[PDB]
């Protein structure tokens, strides 16, 4: 062939933290279909927002919005348990179908995005150039997001484990862990990567007895 | 400057599943220091193996081994709770220091890797070319690894939740979930991505009542 139809920019969705997660890589020949399984961020979460992005930037907000839609009817569950399968499917006509299906409930919702949506030839190059210009900035953002999700997981988890421990955990451990969790929660509210690791460290330091109890149960 | 000292190949470690996780990207100017926080894969895990890799391939086994060492003394904990901070640090002399520290226990272990280790000029190009040749293969591997970790998490989690539920979960739910978990566990033993998703789906399908109980508690 003298010619190939290709994605000029990555395509994906916004994931927790405001980051663009790629489903279809830059430079993919179409037709193509890719899927990934995502989950909920909160206990009892009943819905998720699927926000479709075109571009190469790490902040969702710095990419082109192709549209968004909600999937609801998610059945009560602990966070991170529902399986929310997101499929990006580009046909021979270059139309994009983005679907999200709840494997438990069986509920499906979809957006269809025509081949002319998104960024024009100039902006694809503005985008490419900017992703290059801001590589260091974008990595640091992504590291901060990863750190904040880690802190959050530790926060949420430790709270559940304190609950499950009940009387097994001594007063003095409990008080120390709870103040570490307040400090952590305060830090998850900012954009200071080091402060978050500091508070995650304080928590690791005061949780030893809790971790034994949770492991034993 | 007319010249820049640069990493000719990504540097990283082996993570669960046999995948290379990058700590220092290809083409980084040195000196440089990057860190990421990892955790345990099993309840009560007391040690982790740090395996240092140079290269661009997605299977750990297809990259250059720069050495490995164990960190032990990890205190009993649920899997995914200990904070194991891995730092890669390349100094002005191009020496690499790879350290892993347990934020709870405070234990640290290290490997130091001289600037002449790893792949020579030819092999760096053999490596670059191969990562290109096998892009599709490598992605599929990485998707399979991601799927298997997801299945495993669901397996491990659901087992804990069945335990925590005890009598709240009806006989018929329990029997269905347990047979789905056997089927899942059988599938996690293979390399068949679809079979794993199929068994994760079966589990989502029979776990609705369990998920309610776990969310309520």
């Amino acid at each position: 062939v003298l010619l190939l139809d290709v994605t000029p920019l990555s395509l994906g969705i916004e994931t927790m933290g405001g980051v663009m997660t790629t489903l279809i890589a830059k430079n993919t020949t179409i037709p193509t279909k890719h899927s990934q399984v995502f989950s909920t961020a909160e206990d009892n979460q009943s819905a998720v927002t699927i926000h479709v992005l075109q571009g190469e930037r790490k902040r969702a907000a710095d990419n082109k919005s192709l549209g968004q839609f909600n999937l609801d009817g998610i059945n009560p569950a602990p966070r991170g348990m529902p399986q929310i399968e997101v499929t990006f499917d580009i046909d021979a006509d270059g139309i994009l179908h983005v679907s999200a299906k709840d494997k438990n409930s069986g509920k499906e919702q979809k957006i269809t995005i025509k081949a002319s949506s998104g960024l024009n030839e100039d902006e694809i190059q503005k985008m490419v150039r900017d992703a290059e210009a801001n590589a260091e900035a974008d990595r640091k953002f992504e590291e901060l997001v990863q750190t904040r999700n880690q802190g959050d997981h530790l926060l949420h988890s430790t709270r559940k484990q304190v609950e499950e421990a009940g009387d097994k955990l001594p007063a003095d451990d409990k008080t120390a862990i709870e103040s570490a969790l307040t400090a952590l929660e305060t830090a998850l509210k900012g954009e200071d990567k080091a402060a978050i690791e500091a508070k995650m460290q304080e928590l690791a330091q005061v949780s030893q007895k809790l971790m034994e109890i949770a492991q034993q149960q | 400057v007319l010249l820049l000292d640069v990493t000719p190949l990504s540097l990283g470690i082996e993570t669960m599943g046999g995948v290379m996780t990058t700590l220092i990207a290809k083409n980084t100017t040195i000196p440089t220091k990057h860190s990421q926080v990892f955790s345990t894969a099993e309840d009560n895990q007391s040690a982790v193996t740090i395996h240092v890799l140079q290269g661009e391939r997605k299977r750990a086994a297809d990259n250059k081994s720069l050495g490995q060492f164990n960190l032990d003394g990890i205190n009993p904990a649920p899997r995914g709770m200990p904070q194991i901070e891995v730092t890669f640090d390349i100094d002005a002399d191009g020496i690499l220091h790879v350290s892993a520290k347990d934020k709870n226990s405070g234990k640290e272990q290290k490997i130091t890797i001289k600037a002449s280790s790893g792949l020579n000029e030819d092999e760096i190009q053999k490596m670059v070319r191969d990562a290109e040749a096998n892009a599709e293969a490598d992605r599929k591997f990485e998707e399979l690894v991601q799927t298997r970790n997801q299945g495993d998490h669901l397996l491990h989690s659901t087992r804990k939740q069945v335990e925590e539920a005890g009598d709240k979960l009806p006989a018929d739910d329990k029997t269905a979930i347990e047979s789905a978990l056997t089927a899942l566990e059988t599938a996690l033993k293979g390399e068949d991505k679809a079979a794993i998703e199929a068994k994760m789906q079966e589990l989502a399908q029979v776990s609705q009542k369990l998920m309610e109980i776990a969310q309520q508690q």
């Binding site: 961020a41 009943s46 927002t49 | -």
Partner: peptide, 8 residues
Amino acid sequence: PRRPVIMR
């Protein structure tokens, strides 16, 4: 609603 989280 919340954004999806990369499943664990």
